[PDB]
Amino acid sequence: GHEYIYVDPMQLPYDSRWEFPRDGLVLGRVLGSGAFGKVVEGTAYGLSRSQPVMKVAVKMLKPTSSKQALMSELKIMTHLGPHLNIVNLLGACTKSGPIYIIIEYCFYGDLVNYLHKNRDSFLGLTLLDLLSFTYQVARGMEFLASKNCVHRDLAARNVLLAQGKIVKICDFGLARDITFLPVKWMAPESIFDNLYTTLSDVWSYGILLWEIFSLGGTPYPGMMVDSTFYNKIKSGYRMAKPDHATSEVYEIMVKCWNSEPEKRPSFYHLSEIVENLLPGQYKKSYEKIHLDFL
Numbered sequence: 001g002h003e004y005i006y007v008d009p010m011q012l013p014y015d016s017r018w019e020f021p022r023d024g025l026v027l028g029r030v031l032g033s034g035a036f037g038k039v040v041e042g043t044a045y046g047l048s049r050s051q052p053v054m055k056v057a058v059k060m061l062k063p064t065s066s067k068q069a070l071m072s073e074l075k076i077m078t079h080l081g082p083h084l085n086i087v088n089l090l091g092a093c094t095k096s097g098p099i100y101i102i103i104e105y106c107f108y109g110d111l112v113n114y115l116h117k118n119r120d121s122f123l124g125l126t127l128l129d130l131l132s133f134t135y136q137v138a139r140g141m142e143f144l145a146s147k148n149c150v151h152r153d154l155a156a157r158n159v160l161l162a163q164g165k166i167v168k169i170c171d172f173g174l175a176r177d178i179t180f181l182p183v184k185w186m187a188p189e190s191i192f193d194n195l196y197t198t199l200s201d202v203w204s205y206g207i208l209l210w211e212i213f214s215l216g217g218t219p220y221p222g223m224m225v226d227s228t229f230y231n232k233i234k235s236g237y238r239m240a241k242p243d244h245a246t247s248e249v250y251e252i253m254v255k256c257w258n259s260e261p262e263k264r265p266s267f268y269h270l271s272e273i274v275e276n277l278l279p280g281q282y283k284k285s286y287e288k289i290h291l292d293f294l
């Protein structure tokens with residue numbers, strides 16, 4: 001079947017429709033950094049018609065092999081398409097200078113900080129909210145898997161909250177189409193055998209759920225990543241139920257942490273389960289928003 005081939009998004013051309021004048025972008029504070037580079041706050045003039053002056057986030061390499069990785073990140077983002085639970089690419093500065101990737105700025109920030117600041121409220125922040133976040137992330141991950149994308153860095157730091165409490169997944173760069181790494185979120189196959197699949201991301205989703213239902217807790221609390229950590233996880237060690245987690249959600253985590261990647265639940269499958277855990281009215285409202293967005 002030489003006539004049938006795989007279209008690598010890395011070999012596809014860059015549509016210049018995404019180019020933004022570097023003189024139209026004002027850069028500001030460092031919002032943060034992931035595995036590589038940094039994300040800074042910025043103001044863009046002329047990117048949106050509705051908003052002539054719009055606040056944005058900019059992914060860029062730090063002053064310190066990464067340039068093309070950034071370009072690849074741009075490429076995957078360009079071809080992923082739009083989704084409500086996936087942060088949006090607004091444009092890029094790729095000509096005559098360092099690569100700048102312009103992305104949507106989310107008001108409430110990352111879930112980790114949100115969950116932390118609204119911890120005491122958890123007695124604003126409500127259990128239903130947590131489940132909603134869980135559902136939306138599952139949907140966005142389903143979208144990425146549909147697009148044959150393995151994020152490789154699913155975590156609460158990379159799940160953002162936009163206005164309307166709509167979650168957005170961010171931080172590609174470690175993403176691949178079917179270096180320091182986020183071990184406590186990585187599956188055993190990925191760490192020991194360098195194998196990454198959608199199922200590996202499912203493991204990360206479980207770690208994410210523990211983060212959410214621990215209200216911002218650090219995975220494997222107190223444990224330092226070392227020889228013993230790996231031996232334990234290899235032997236089958238798994239984290240215990242988080243304090244604010246139901247048996248039903250912990251079960252989801254347990255499934256996600258099966259040693260057999262093929263036995264872990266799919267994001268499609270994961271979506272339905274969480275749906276049941278929430279009011280059936282939720283699905284409809286979600287769909288409405290998910291149609292308006294487009």
Ligand SMILES: c1cc2c3nc(ccc3c1)-n1cnc3ccc(cc31)OCCCNC1CCN2CC1
Pocket residue numbers: 031032033034039057058059087103104105106107109110157158160170171172
């Ligand atoms: C990679 C890593 C990121 C990204 N972030 C973005 C946009 C694209 C990103 C790409 N983005 C959007 N609106 C934000 C509001 C706050 C913010 C980042 C925001 O940083 C605050 C918390 C820092 N924690 C992580 C730092 C790196 N992050 C994800 C969050």
